Amino acid sequence: KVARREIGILTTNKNTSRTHKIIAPANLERPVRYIRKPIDYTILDDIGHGVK
């Protein structure tokens, strides 16, 4: 115990951890279906000083 106390002074925690190579997200991205919708020139009207 005396010997270990003497060398303990010269030590500090070696912050090492262990994880997985790949960690998937909790919720995988949902496949969004394609739906055709016409060009709309009003979608920016509420951004900044818009003009209706």
Partner: peptide, 18 residues
Amino acid sequence: PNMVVWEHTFTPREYLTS
């Protein structure tokens, strides 16, 4: 330490360890 690709986390050093 790690990188996130399409919400997936990759840890390079774990490849080496293994």
